[PDB]
Each structure stands twice: as C-alpha cells, then as structure tokens.
Ligand binder design. Structure first.
Ligand code: ATP
Ligand code: ADP
Ligand code: MG
Ligand code: MG
Ligand code: ZN
Lengths: 594, 93, 92, 96, 566, 189
C-alpha cells in the first residue's frame, strides 16, 4: 500500500529531476549500468529541492525507507537498460553539520548522521545472504527468501508433521554479497580533555568495500543503529557513503584516478619554468630559512625510481633524511609538516616506540587461540614517509630493527610459527640531538655523534644544523616570528597542502626518470673525487664517523632521479645532477668535513 | 573565557631584546637562548593581558614580560659579569 | 592569418615559404572568402564580447573599436571575429 | 570578577595572593601566576602549531620554600598532578 | 534640459532614432563601478537594447578622473552617451570642457534650435541637481523623477533671472537664493532601476526578469535610505501581484519560476547559513543585544532557549534544519521576539525560486552581489587597485544571470567571510573604545588592525561604518552625530576618510523620522581642501569619501572641528 | 594542415546544426511585407518572404525563421511530429518492434533542441512533457543501437531510419571497427 506509493515517488524523482536540460540521475544511472556499476549516488540537497516530503520520509525511518529507494532504482534501471541485474545500491551525499564522534548517543539512534574520523582497522571481506534457497527436511518443500541488509530475518520456524526449524539452506542456488567491518577513531584535535580516543564499529556493503586503508582520515554518512550481541545494545554505524581526501584506489593499484581536468592542471603546473622554487617555498611557510632542508624534504617526498634487475636484485628508490641539530632549529615542526603534507605518513616518537611497535607484532586472537600479525608504523606507512622524532632517544634494541626496513624495504618475521616477509617501502625522516645537546666544536665529531656508522650509512642526506648567533639573522627570525604571532600569497609562488599532495601522488604514479650517459659520467667523477677527499681528510687519531660508501652514490642517483621526476621529465640531465651534487655537498659532505 | 590577541606592539623593541639576549648568551656555559624564548616573551605578555580579563595585549603587559625574562636571564649569570649585564640591560628593565 | 629557436634553419625557411604560399593563395580568385578564417559555422549574428587585453583605438576594416580592458561590446560576430582569434576579445 | 579586573592594580594583587604564607620570593610568585594563567595557543593557517603554555623551573637552596609553592599550585590549579623524582617512570608520565 | 516622467519614452525613441545603425556602433554607456543600483539599471538597459539589436559598449568607471579620461578618449561616431549612476551633482559641461559650438551640426534660424552630434543622458538618483545641467545646458539631458517641477520652480526663476542679467540688489537676492539652494547636503531620492522600469512600462517591455532587476535595485537602498525603500515598496507589491499568474495549483516543474511576497527577516543570509549565524551576524540584532561582548552572547543563548529551539538545532544549516521548527518559525518569532526588543525583525520581502532549486530573497541576492563587487577575484598601485575593482564589476554583472549560479554561491560564501571579518573589526574597535566623541561629530581611526587591507575598498569601509552606526549609536538614546571613519594602507601610506550621516532608530515612524538627514560632509571637505594645502583627493563619485596623506589627517581634523559646518 | 584532425572524416555538431538549419519551416508572420526593401537572397527563395501577410501560414528557411523570431516578428509553428500524442505513438511503435527504428524525421534531435532553446512559448504542449518524451525515445534508440552494434562485419551494414546526429556520433567507432575487420579479412585471403 504505502510502500508502493513510496516506490512510485522515488521513481518519479529519478525520472523527472533536471536543473537545466540534463536529467542528472537518469543519465548517471545509464552510465553506471554501462560499465557494470550497479549503484547510484544521490545528493540530498537535490532530494530536498524536488520534494521536502520525500526527504522527511527518508530521514524519519531510514532503515525502512532506503530499501524501497533501492527497489525503485532497480526498477528504473531495468526500464532504462533492458528492452522488453541485481538490486542496486544507494549511496548518499550530504552537507549537514558533522557530529563529533563522542557526541553520538541515545538521541541519535536510528538516524542519518555525518561524522569524520581516522580508520585504524579493516576486516577481511565476509559473505552476506541476499537470495536464499531453502528446503524442508521432511516433505522437501522448495522455498525462497529475499533479504535486505538493513536491520531494524530468519529461517521459518514452521514448515509450509515437521519439527521446529525444519528448513535447510541450499547453497548452490543462493546469491551472496560482500561485507566488511571497519574501526573508526576520532580525530586527535576533537578529543575532549584528558580522554582516550574512542573507537566505533562500522560496516559497508558491496561497492563501499575496499575503499579505505588504515590510517587515513575519512568522512562517513550512515545510520547510527544498534545490535544485540540483556538491557543493552552495542552501537554501530551502517555506512551509506565514504568521502576521503586520499585516492586509495590509485595508491594500491597501478591504475590511477585523475579527472581530465586534473591531469591537465598538473601538466600546466609541471610546465612552469620554476616549479622547484614554488615547491621549496610551499613547504613550512611559517619557518624562516632552512632552504636546503626544504629542498631535501621535497626530494624525499618526490622520491626516486626503483629498478628490478633481470637476476632478481632490487634497488631501493626511497630517500631518507636525518636532522642532527641544536634545540630551537624547528626540526620537529618540519617533521609535523611533512607528516601533514605527504599522502601517507605516520608521526612517531623514538622514545615512545618499540621494536614490535615499528615493524609488526605477533598477536594471539582471544577466541580462536591462533597467532596473527598486526602492523606497525612501517607497515601502516607503506608507500609513504615515517617521521621518527627524537631519534636519539630510541633504545639500541628498538633501533636495530629498522635497518632491513630502511635498506631492503622488507620485514622478516619468524615468531610463533609464522614465517613471512612483509613489504615496507617507506622513507624515513628522523630528527635527533647530539650527545651533549649541542654540537660542541671543541670536541671531535665522533664524540658529538653516538650513532654507529651502520645506521648513518643508510641515511641519504645528513644535516648537521648548528645555531649560530648572528645579529642580522637573529633580527630577521625575530621579525618573522613576530609577524607570524601577530598576524596568503597564492600568486603562483606557493600551492596549498591539498594541491601539493595531489601533485606528489600524480608524479609518483606517473614518472620514473632515468640517467643519461653524461649524468653517469659526471656522477662517477664526483664519487671518485668525494671518496678521495674523504681518504685525504682522515686523521691518524680517529676514523671518519660520517661514512661515504656505495650507498651515498645510490643516494645521489636517487636525488637526481627525484629532481628529474619533479618536472615530469622522462630523462635526468646534467642540470639535475648539478643540483643533486650541490645538495649532497651542502648536507652530507658538510657534516663529514667538520 | 579569555583569549587575548596582539595587534599593536613595538616590533623593534622585542627584536632588539632578543638579539641582545642571544649576543650575551653566546658565552660558554650560559643559559640557552633560542626562538623558544622570544615565543615565551610573547606568551608571558599574553598571560599578563589575560590576568586583567583584557581581550587585547597592551604595551604595559609586553614591557612587564620583557622585564621578567631579562631579569631572569641577568640573575642566571655569574657574580663577576652580573654587574656588567645588569648595566647593559638597564634600558629594558 | 599567414619560439622559432626550436626550429632548424631548414624548417624556418620552409615555414616562411609556406606562409608566402598561403598569402599568394589568399590573393587569388578566393579573395572574397578568407581561407584562413574560422571553421565553426556561423550561428548568431550579434554576440556579446569582452576585452581581455588593453589596447589602443585599433581601426579595423569594419569599424573603430576602442578596446578598453574590461569593457563589453554588443557587436556582430563577423566584425570582431579576427580580434577574438588573436585573443584581444572574448565571447561571453 | 569583571569589577575586580577593572581595577588598575589587579596584576599586583594577583601576584601578592600567590602563596600568601610564603614571605618573599616575588619572582617565584610572578612566574607561578604566569604559568597558572598561561598563554594562548595558535594555529597559523592550520599548518603551524605554536605552544601556548608556560613552563617554570625552580633551581634553589634546600630550604627556600619550593615544595610548598608546588603544593599551592596543585591546590589552585583546576587540574593538577603531583609527582616526585624517582617516583615517576618514563611511561607513568605520558601513556602506557 | 531635463525629461519629465512621461518623456522617458521620447528619450528612448530619440536614442533609437540617432544611435541605431547596423554598420557601426554609436552608443556608449558609462556606469558607476561600485553601485548595485547602477549595475541593475545598466543590465536592464543592456537587455532592452539587445532586444532592438542596438550596437553598444559598456564601460565601468571609478571616479571622475577616469570619466574625464574615457570621455577624452571617445570617438566621434558616438551619437549618444549614457551616464548611469553619476554626473547629477557636477557640471558636466564645465567639468568635461564641452563647448557647444564645437559640438553643433546644423543651426536653423527659424527653428531657433541647434543640432549636436553627441548627446549625453544622465541617470542620477543623487540630489541636489546642478542647475547648470538642468536649466542652462542643452547638450546635457537629465532623467528627472519630477523633482524639478515639484520643488525647483523658485530656483528655476532665480537662475533664469540671473542669466537674464539698483539692479545690484536684485542680483544679490537671486544669487543669495541660489547659494542657499547650493548650500544643502547630498542624499538619494529615488532608485534608477525604478525609472528604467517606468520607461519599460511606458514602452511595454516589462516582464519578470525586469521586475526582478527592479526589485534588486530598489532593495539595494534599504540598508542606508530606508525611506526611499518604504516609498517604493507599494509599487513593487502591486507589480508583483500584476505579473504573477492567478493560479498556483499546478505542481512544481523543473522550469517553473516563482516570485512571491513572503515574510522576510532582518537577518544575515538566513537561507544560506544557520539560524544562529543569522542572528549573530546581523547589524540590528547586534545593535539591540550588543553581541560584541559575553553579555550579548548570553542573552542570545537565553532567547534561543526560551524559543524552544535547541542550540544544536539552531546551528544546523537551513536546508537540513528540522522541518517542524522551520514551519513554526513564524509563530515562534511572533511570540518571543517582542520580549528581547527584536520586534522589527518581522518584515515582508521578495523571494524568487526556480524549479527544483533553492529559494533566495532579494536582500540575500544584493548581499551576494555586493560581496562579489568588494572582494571578488604610488599612482601605479592606485591604478592597479581601481583596475581590480573594475574587473570585479564584471563578476558582479555575471552573477545576475540565471545560468551562472556558481558565481552566486561563491558570492554568498564571500559575503559570509566579509561579514565575519567586519564583525571582528567592529569588536576590536568597540572593545578598545577607539570612537572618540567630539561635540560636533564622532571620530574613529584604524591604524593597526588585523585586516586593514580589506578596507581599501570604499564599499567595505561603508559596510563597517554602517555596522558601527547601527551598533551603540542608533541605540543608547544619544543625540545623532555624523561619524568619521578612517583607515590606513601601508602599501601607499595614505588614509581613506569616509563621512557617514546619522540614522534614526530603525522602524520608528515619526514626524522627525519622516524628515531626512542630509550629508553635509562633501561641502566641508571641499572647503577645507581648497583652503588648506594637503593634496587631498575628491575624485570619488561619493563626495564624502576622500583620500588623505598620512601626515595631514591631524590638521584636517583640527580644521574640521573648527569649521562647524558639519 | 589546412583542416584540423577533429574535422577529418566527420562533422562536428555545429556543422550538423548548420546543415539542419537549411531546411524549411512554417511560421506565422507578425508583419505584412506583401504590397497591395525587398528580400533578394541567392541561397534560398525570396518569393515567400516578400509575399508574407500577418497571421497567415508561410514557409521560410529555419535560420531566417529564427532571425525573425529573435525580433518577435514571427511565431514558429512547431512540427506536427513534435506533439505529445505523436511522440507517445512513436514510443509505442519503438516498444512493439525491438528490431527496427521508428520513422522519426532525420533531424528530430537537432530541431527539437533548437526549438526548445529558441521557441519556448510557441509550443502548444508543456515543454517538460516534450523533454521527457524525447529523453525516453533517445534511451530506447540507444538500447537498440547497442543491441545492433553486435553484428559488425567485413561486409555491408544497414541502419534504417537512424537520425543524422546518431549517425554522426557513431561514425568513428563503426567505421574504424569495420575497416579493421575488412583489413583482417583481406589479409587472410
Ligand atoms: N626559523 C623559525 N621560524 C619559525 N619558528 C621557528 C623557527 N625556529 C624555531 N622556531 C620555533 O621554535 C620552537 C622550537 O620547537 P621545535 O620543537 O620546533 O624545535 P626542534 O628544532 O625540534 O628542537 P628540539 O631538539 O629541542 O626538540 C617552535 O615553536 C618553532 O616554531
Ligand atoms: N620564604 C619562606 N616563608 C615562609 N616559610 C618558609 C620560607 N622558606 C621556608 N619556609 C618554611 O620552611 C620549610 C621548607 O621546606 P620545603 O620548602 O618543603 O623544602 P624544599 O625547599 O626542599 O622543598 C617549609 O615548611 C616552610 O614553612
Ligand atoms: Mg623536537
Ligand atoms: Mg623540596
Ligand atoms: Zn515440512
């Protein structure tokens, strides 16, 4: 009765809506059907504009109204695609005020709410029932059940003498869909005073699965429902739409998602004759100076190219940077900005870290009594950057666990009968202080650095930042900080964080330059010169604490390749080699000479 | 309920105070000085403004914060050079 | 109608000769038509245009248009077609 | 509170009211008052975060009324936690 | 000469007869760059001329210097020139160096009249009219709304007798009456869009788009000159009634266009923001509650609690707000606003809707247009700034079209941001007690604000001045006093002084409130500039807004206080 | 070279519109040109325009009709096939015969768009109903086109009653696929 009228109203909305001369949803449905995408995304503002009564009905009882909308969508799709198809999915978009995750309570039960959080865990896809074929044990009566996934269904209790629960499901004739479980935490800035972050259980169906990876901020539209695991119900969220600022599909696939209008914006930006200066100025605009470190951070974000030889040998393509300096250098702020801007990044404190924290941890399931592997910062930050603040504070034991991750880009685990080799292709940006808290020029460099050469060799560029008291620089920095405290170019001299992140993703997924023969010759000459200089610089008393090995040649090659990739240039020429050599001389040889 | 802001302030005074503090702190074994302490001067000015439930930092509050920081720095010095440091910094305090 | 550092000398000479040939073709019995004209069929006789780059009082064959930047004209598409082609005006 | 604040010498009274039982140390009372009131945190364009709290250190002689000052600060502050030197672990502070 | 109300059709026919030839264009329109009323009037004229296939050029203009430059740059093929939104107060003949002899074409002794190649039409709402343009000159034609015949007969006689000439006493009396007429200030008497709509009705080209543009032009004056809006409101009501289809029983269609007289409110962008924001960022609400301190916020929270609207519900956006409260809002306001003194928020406005789109009121449309005009996106920097404003004029022009709705949404967002910034600046001004009070006038000078750049545009400065005038001045039972608002830009080291006329309490019909208040600051500023030597600029069309050098403001204010002509 | 790449082997939509506007149409003149200056056209006939009387049916070219309509000097008489009843009949014919195409005019889509944009008050029926009917007809024809695209071969192909705009849209894909199939077959021999 009323359900038929609701379905008719939804069908009329789909078939009649138009804002100028295009039937938006009709054409969208046809296009989605063309590519075997059985769904439909509806903007709630359009629904409100068309008829407020329909929106009122949808908001009052979402769990009972949405299935009718899906049925209407399926009927319209059949009309539009077949000339006389599973049930279609409804995905909603809204601009309503976001409710803090902690403000969700009894008052919001069985209502459509919008909230944002951080995904911390995802489950393995399960199988749900949509069309069930059943048969009775005694009289063998064939029957069917149609199930919707919205919960306010069971096998009949009485056959259609037969005992209680006489029906048995025939599996080979049934149809199933995909289901996934997600854990959503609240944003750190939104947490109340002195409270632990709160977790929320969420579920997605069909086309909303495999859309988010752990550690990425997302915005969720869903129904705040409850399920009985005696006078209490466990809250959960039924996802209706996922909106994220990171293209997860283009990250875990070689496939790349970028609109034609995007692709052509990133080409025009790359065509800029001085993109390098723009990006250098676009990193930490609130920090004065440190231009070389900003260039190093740009190179680290862009990264190099990785080569897999026919014999199976693999060459690293990630750039690591270490910052050893005096207090007040703004290293931690740079690390925070890098974590904010990179598409994937994890900010960790050395002090508050462990061997099992930063690689992977053997964890026993409470129920199955079986051991599984959870992941740590270097698995959660796979394909991104790991900002290891307070590098010096880290225990030896903890520290030593990082070597293979940095160099071989893998994690080897042999624990509780688990023998596996995980993948961790990450870049490490670390900050640390000298032994005495300042770089005392009176003492030798060896006494100022407690780091063993093995860990230091893995860092492509090492920056020894010393605070020099110069009146002019001090006045300039004071003026800059005062202007910051008391106080938007966007005239081609700087691009916002979002655009920079998108450009970084595009460049990483699009270009992987290569060195020209002239670049190789120049690089070999420079490597020979640098090694000869290091040999000459040696003193009988001590051996060089800062090392120069083949890893430094590989690091310089990576820097050159990243510089070439910056401009989407398929080949790296001597122009980029000169800049890479200058950066290496300014950071690593500068640290070593002292 | 109070969040004071800085809109009118003597930039040159604070810049010169910071530069002088750095120059005097170049000495070995002295109390460390960095941009953190300029930010601390600004923070103490904000706190002094907050003590009056005022919505804007006044010049008097900034002067008081400068005096506090400079007095602490001077007192942290040695006996031999304390007189010279106090004479040099008498302008701000 | 009829930088260069990327071109070689042969290509530059070829371009010059081809431009001369195009002009010679335009100078023939097809003078009434403008071979190097717009290939979009004419649709509207009168259109609104907006000045994009400041320029003096340029005296065109059809008339005199004092192209003050940020000023709209309601004129025929044919008269100001060339100016739109060179980028002085915009159809909006 | 508004009436009290409108007074010219409010700051002097506030400083004098810090630990009235401690005779002098008008430099340890001023610092304590400043720390108690604190600064204003700032977030420039959503990219730069600046601390808005004041930290104080008392390095002095054995019997110069420092622990009493700390106790008074604990009493006055809305949320306060007291810890001793060796009584505090690296993860008893922070999180565990 | 001037054209009466009934001569608009004759003037339009003259324009058609002279400036109409498909061979080349002969019509140029000069428009005030920072006036919404002029924008709407020029849009109406542009559509009308497009209908008749009249070649034309539209040139935005800022200030009198640019007018002189552009007029000097005009070609000889321009038979008619349109001055929309300015020119009424100044002597165009003397200012533009127009000599009638060099402009004549043919002279007939029998006819006694001379034909001129170029004609100038003035569409100015400001008063007083310059008698040289009205009664003396023949090249200058003014679109009068009847003021000349209604009240300028005696001045007409005096001027004619002066031209026609013991006689010293008669000359003294006539020049004295002329000086007395010229000694008054300047105000706005009518909306130019109303006159354009009257012309269209005379020639029978009135439709719903023209009516919408007329409504926008008329309501643009509501903020400042409420008496003009009150005088013109009944005609707008009658026209909306006439142009609306009788039957509304048909269900909505994608192409349906609605234009209703629905209850509007003196709230800031009610339909495109939250109710809490609407009450918070309103000039009237802040004036009647003092929302710039904690007491005002507490009072607003108490009001919302007594109305029965939860704080979470109030802060919800308009579209997604609970429908029961939205439907009951009229009753809720009817019963609760009187307690807190906000009885004036109740009002009737014009709301326009398109099929399956949102509904927007006239005030919100005008706010979006003004926001686009303001923040849309030595002598060299000034020229660049004025060029940027001229460019913003075209964004505002584009926003008037139904196809360009994204521009309207962007303008709405910019309006929200601008109102927030102005509220912050006003809070800073009032907390610091920067508004010095002198017996003759009030004074307020901005020197070290956080958003000083925004106030280089005269429109933003006027917005802030209106915010300050309504707040703590319209109330408090304080004698009306003109206000002086000045701002500073470091990139050029100069001031932007703006005189503002006082306003009576809003919605208080009275005999003294019926009488208007004139803006006398133009005369005093001109006299001081002529007597003093400070290199002041009076190039702006709004004569009350001037630019002053950094050093000279103190002597200028001393002389202003000592003049006593405010 | 002389001709861009996107104009090669196919017509742009603007060219299709230009071709369409050469066809005749019926109008109601709102002025009396006939006598009881003179149009002298070289591409079309000028007799009809000169012998034009008020509120009397006459036939002129579509672009001339639109030019007159802009001046509000003529009301365009919509085509008979552009009525709700006729569109419904065509939809029924399409539904009943899944193998053929309805005998719509070869310029129905372009003419419908032009008339909807330029002449909105001339139609006797509501515009939204006509838009919906045209949309439904377009989707049905698209389904039929997709079904019929499965028979591409090296030999000929027949698409009867298909309109000009649809043929223009499908020309690249169909032509290239059939050309490649023919090339493969020729190489096979
Ligand atoms: N050049 C600069 N520009 C702006 N702010 C600066 C600059 N240098 C330092 N600061 C400020 O100084 C403070 C230093 O704190 P920060 O945590 O960034 O230091 P750090 O270099 O990581 O030192 P530490 O080794 O002591 O942890 C921060 O507030 C930072 O904003
Ligand atoms: N300036 C002072 N005024 C008043 N009482 C003081 C002062 N200095 C010390 N005392 C007294 O002496 C004792 C000092 O002990 P305490 O301050 O706890 O030791 P410590 O300084 O090592 O923390 C306190 O009980 C206090 O009452
Ligand atoms: Mg740090
Ligand atoms: Mg103690
Ligand atoms: Zn049975």
């Amino acid at each position: 009765d009323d359900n038929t009228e609701i379905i008719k109203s939804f069908k009329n909305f789909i078939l009649e809506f138009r804002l100028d001369s295009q039937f938006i949803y009709r054409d969208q449905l046809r296009n989605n059907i063309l590519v075997k995408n059985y769904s439909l995304t509806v903007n709630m503002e359009h629904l409100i504009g068309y008829n407020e009564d329909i929106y009122k009905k949808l908001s009052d009882e979402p769990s009972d109204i949405i299935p009718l909308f899906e049925t209407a969508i399926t009927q319209v799709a059949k009309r539009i695609s077949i000339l006389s198809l599973p049930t279609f999915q409804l995905i909603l978009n809204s601009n309503a005020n976001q409710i803090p995750l902690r403000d969700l309570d009894s008052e919001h039960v069985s209502k459509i709410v919008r909230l944002s959080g951080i995904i911390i865990s995802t489950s393995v896809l399960s199988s749900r029932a949509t069309y069930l074929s059943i048969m009775c044990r005694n009289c063998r009566h064939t029957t069917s059940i149609t199930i919707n996934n919205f919960n306010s269904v069971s096998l009949p209790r009485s056959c259609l003498n037969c005992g209680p629960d006489p029906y048995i499901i025939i599996h080979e004739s049934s149809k199933f869909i995909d289901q996934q479980f997600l854990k959503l935490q609240e944003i750190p800035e939104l947490v109340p005073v002195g409270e632990m972050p709160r977790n929320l259980t969420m579920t997605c169906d069909r086309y909303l699965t495999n859309k988010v990876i752990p550690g990425t901020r997302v915005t969720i539209v869903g129904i705040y429902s409850i399920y009985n695991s005696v006078a209490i119900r466990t809250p959960y969220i039924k996802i209706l739409g996922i909106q994220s600022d990171v293209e997860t599909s283009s990250i875990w696939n070689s496939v790349t998602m970028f609109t034609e209008e995007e692709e052509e914006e990133f080409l025009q930006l790359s065509r800029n004759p001085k993109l390098y200066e723009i990006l250098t100025n676009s990193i930490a605009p609130s920090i004065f100076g440190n231009e070389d470190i900003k260039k190093a951070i740009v190179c680290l974000l862009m990264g190099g190219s990785k080569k897999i030889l026919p014999d199976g040998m693999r060459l690293r393509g990630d750039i690591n940077v270490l910052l050893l300096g005096d207090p007040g250098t703004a290293k931690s702020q740079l690390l925070k900005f890098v974590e904010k801007v990179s598409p994937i990044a994890v900010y960790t404190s050395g002090k508050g870290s462990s061997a099992a924290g930063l690689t992977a941890s053997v964890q026993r399931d409470p129920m199955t009594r079986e051991f599984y592997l959870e992941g740590g910062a270097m698995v959660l930050a796979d394909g991104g950057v790991v900002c290891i603040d307070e590098f010096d504070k880290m225990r030896d034991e903890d520290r030593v666990a990082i070597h293979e991750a940095m160099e071989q880009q893998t994690i080897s685990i042999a624990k509780a009968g688990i023998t596996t080799v995980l993948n961790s292709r990450t870049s490490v940006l670390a900050a640390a202080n000298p032994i005495y808290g300042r770089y005392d020029d009176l003492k030798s460099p060896g006494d100022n650095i407690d780091f063993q050469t093995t860990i230091l060799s893995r860092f492509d560029m090492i920056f020894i930042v010393k605070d020099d008291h110069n009146e002019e620089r001090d006045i300039s920095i004071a003026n800059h900080v005062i202007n910051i405290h008391t106080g938007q170019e966007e005239n081609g001299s700087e691009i916002s964080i979002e655009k920079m992140k998108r450009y970084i993703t595009y460049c990483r997924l699009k270009c992987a330059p290569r060195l020209s023969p002239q670049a190789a010759e120049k690089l070999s000459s420079n490597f020979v010169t640098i090694r000869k200089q290091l040999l000459i610089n040696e003193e009988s008393t001590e051996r060089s604490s800062i090392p120069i090995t083949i890893r430094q040649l590989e690091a310089i090659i990576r820097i050159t390749e990243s510089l070439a990739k910056l401009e989407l240039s398929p080949i790296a020429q001597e122009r980029h080699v000169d800049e890479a050599i200058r950066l290496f001389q300014a950071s690593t040889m500068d640290a070593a000479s002292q | 309920k109070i969040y004071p802001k800085l809109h009118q302030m003597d930039m040159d005074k604070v810049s010169r105070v910071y530069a002088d503090l750095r120059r005097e702190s170049i000495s070995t074994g002295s109390f460390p000085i960095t941009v953190r302490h300029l930010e601390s001067i600004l923070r103490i000015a904000e706190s002094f403004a907050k003590m009056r439930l005022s919505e804007f930092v006044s010049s008097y509050d900034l002067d008081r914060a400068i005096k506090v920081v400079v007095d602490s720095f001077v007192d942290a010095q040695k006996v031999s050079v304390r007189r010279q440091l106090r004479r040099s910094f008498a302008i701000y305090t | 109608n009829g930088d260069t550092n990327n071109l070689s000398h042969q290509e530059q000479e070829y371009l010059k000769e081809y431009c001369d040939l195009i002009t010679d073709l335009k100078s023939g019995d097809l003078v009434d038509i403008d071979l190097s004209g717009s290939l979009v069929p004419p649709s509207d006789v009168f259109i609104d245009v907006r000045v994009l780059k400041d320029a003096g009082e340029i005296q065109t064959e059809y008339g005199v248009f004092n192209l003050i930047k940020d000023s709209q004209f309601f004129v025929r598409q044919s008269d100001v077609e060339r100016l739109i082609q060179q980028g002085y005006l915009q159809k909006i | 509170f508004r009436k009290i604040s409108r007074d010219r010498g409010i700051i002097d009274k506030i400083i004098s009211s810090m630990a009235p039982s401690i005779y002098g140390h008008r430099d340890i009372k001023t610092a304590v008052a400043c720390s108690l009131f604190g600064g204003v945190p700032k977030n420039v364009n959503g990219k730069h975060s600046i601390r808005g709290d004041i930290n104080v250190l008392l390095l002095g002689d054995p019997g110069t009324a420092k622990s009493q000052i700390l106790k008074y600060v604990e009493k006055t502050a809305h949320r306060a936690v007291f810890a001793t030197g060796q009584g505090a672990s690296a993860v008893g502070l922070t999180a565990s | 000469m001037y054209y009466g109300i009934s001569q608009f059709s004759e003037a339009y026919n003259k324009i058609l007869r002279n400036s109409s030839s498909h061979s080349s264009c002969q019509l140029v329109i000069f428009v005030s760059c920072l006036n919404i009323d002029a924008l709407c009037a020029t849009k109406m004229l542009s559509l009308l001329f497009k209908k008749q296939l009249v070649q034309s050029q539209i040139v935005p203009i800022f200030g009198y210097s640019e007018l002189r430059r552009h007029y000097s740059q005009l070609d000889d093929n321009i038979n008619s020139l349109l001055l929309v939104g300015f020119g009424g107060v100044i002597d165009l003949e003397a200012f533009l160096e127009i000599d009638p002899q060099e402009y004549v074409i043919d002279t007939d002794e029998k006819s006694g009249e001379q034909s001129f190649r170029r004609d100038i039409y003035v569409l100015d709402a400001h008063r007083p009219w310059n008698l040289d343009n009205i009664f003396g000159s023949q090249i200058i034609q003014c679109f009068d709304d009847g003021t000349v015949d209604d009240t300028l007969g005696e001045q007409k006689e005096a001027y004619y007798k002066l031209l026609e000439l013991q006689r010293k006493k008669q000359i003294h009396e006539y020049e004295g009456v002329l000086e007395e007429y010229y000694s008054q200030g300047t105000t706005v008497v009518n909306s130019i869009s109303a006159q354009i709509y009257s012309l269209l009705s005379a020639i029978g080209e009135t439709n719903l788009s023209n009516l919408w543009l007329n409504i926008l032009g008329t309501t643009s004056l509501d903020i400042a000159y409420a008496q003009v809006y009150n005088r013109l409101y009944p005609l707008l009501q009658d026209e909306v009634k006439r142009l609306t289809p009788s039957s509304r029983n048909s269900v909505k269609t994608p192409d349906t266009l609605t234009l209703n007289i629905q209850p509007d409110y003196y709230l800031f962008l009610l339909r495109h923001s939250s109710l809490y924001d609407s009450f918070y960022y309103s000039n009237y609400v802040n004036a009647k509650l003092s929302l710039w301190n904690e007491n005002g916020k507490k009072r607003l929270h108490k009001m919302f609690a007594r109305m029965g609207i939860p704080l979470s519900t109030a802060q919800e956006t308009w579209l997604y707000m609970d429908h029961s409260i939205k439907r009951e809002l009229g009753i809720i306001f009817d019963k609760n606003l009187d307690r807190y003194g906000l009885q004036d928020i109740i009002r009737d406005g014009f709301v326009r809707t398109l099929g399956y789109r949102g509904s927007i009121s006239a005030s919100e449309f005008v706010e979006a247009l003004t926001a686009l005009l303001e923040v849309g996106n030595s002598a060299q920097k000034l020229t660049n700034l004025r060029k940027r404003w001229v460019s913003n004029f075209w964004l505002s022009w584009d926003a008037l079209d139904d196809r360009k709705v994204e521009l309207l949404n962007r303008g709405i967002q910019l309006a929200q941001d601008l109102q927030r910034a102005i509220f912050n600046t006003g809070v800073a001004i009032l907390e610091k007690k920067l508004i010095k009070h002198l017996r003759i006038y009030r004074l307020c000078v901005l020197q070290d604000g956080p958003d000083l750049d925004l106030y280089r545009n005269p429109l933003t400065l006027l917005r802030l001045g209106n915010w300050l005038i309504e707040c703590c001045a319209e109330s408090e039972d304080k004698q009306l006093l003109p206000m002086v608002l000045a701002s500073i830009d470091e990139n050029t080291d100069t001031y932007l002084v703006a005189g503002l006329t006082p306003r009576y309490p809003r919605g208080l019909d009275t005999i003294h409130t019926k009488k208007p208040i004139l803006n006398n600051f133009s005369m005093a500023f001109q006299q001081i500039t002529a007597e003093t030597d400070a290199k002041v600029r009076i190039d702006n069309f709004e004569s009350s807004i001037i630019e002053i050098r950094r050093e000279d403001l103190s002597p200028f204010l001393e002389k202003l206080t000592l003049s006593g002509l405010l | 070279m002389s001709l861009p790449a996107h104009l090669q082997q196919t017509f742009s939509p603007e060219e299709i519109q230009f071709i369409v506007e050469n066809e005749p149409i019926k109008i109601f003149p709102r002025i009396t040109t006939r006598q009881k200056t003179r149009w002298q056209l070289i591409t079309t006939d000028d007799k009809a325009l000169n012998n034009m009387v008020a509120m009397r049916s006459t036939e002129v070219v579509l672009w001339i009709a639109l030019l007159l309509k802009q001046q509000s000097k003529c009301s365009i008489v919509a085509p008979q096939w552009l009525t709700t009843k006729e569109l419904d009949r065509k939809i029924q014919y399409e539904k009943t015969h899944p193998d053929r195409f309805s005998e719509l005019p070869w310029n129905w889509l372009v003419l419908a768009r032009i008339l909807f944009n330029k002449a909105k008050d001339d139609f006797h029926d509501p515009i939204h109903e006509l838009r919906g009917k045209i949309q439904d007809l377009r989707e049905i024809r698209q389904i039929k086109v997709l079904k019929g695209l499965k028979y591409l071969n090296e030999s000929h192909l027949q698409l009867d009653n298909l309109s000009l705009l649809e043929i223009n849209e499908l020309r690249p894909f169909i032509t290239e696929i059939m050309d490649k199939l023919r090339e493969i077959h020729t190489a096979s021999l």
